[PDB]
Amino acid sequence: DPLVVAASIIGILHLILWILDRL
Amino acid sequence: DPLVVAASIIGILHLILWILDRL
Amino acid sequence: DPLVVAASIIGILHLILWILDRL
Amino acid sequence: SDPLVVAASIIGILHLILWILDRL
Numbered sequence: 001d002p003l004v005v006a007a008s009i010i011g012i013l014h015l016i017l018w019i020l021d022r023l
Numbered sequence: 024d025p026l027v028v029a030a031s032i033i034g035i036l037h038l039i040l041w042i043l044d045r046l
Numbered sequence: 047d048p049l050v051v052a053a054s055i056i057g058i059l060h061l062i063l064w065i066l067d068r069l
Numbered sequence: 070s071d072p073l074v075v076a077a078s079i080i081g082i083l084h085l086i087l088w089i090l091d092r093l
């Protein structure tokens with residue numbers, strides 16, 4: 001499902017940003 | 024599956040909100 | 047997939063916790 | 070079995086762990 005695939009990419013991005021935001 | 028679809032929408036929302044919370 | 051169903055529930059939970067902490 | 074979706078699932082579970090530990 002493209003909605004699930006899109007949420008997958010976004011959740012990967014979210015953790016990257018959250019880690020960078022804590023660094 | 025409705026639960027996976029719901030979490031997908033919710034994860035999209037989550038990142039939007041978090042980004043805004045930092046801006 | 048139990049990983050995907052589990053991450054769905056956990057993702058819903060994470061957003062609920064973020065909102066509560068925000069509110 | 071989509072590796073994107075499995076990866077994001079694993080990452081989403083870790084994200085919550087980090088958030089909770091950062092909360093506690």
Ligand SMILES: C[C@H](N)[C@]12C[C@H]3C[C@H](C[C@H](C3)C1)C2
Binds near residue numbers: 004008055057078
């Ligand atoms: C909401 C999660 N980040 C989640 C992770 C995986 C991708 C999508 C759907 C579900 C599995 C739940 C988003």
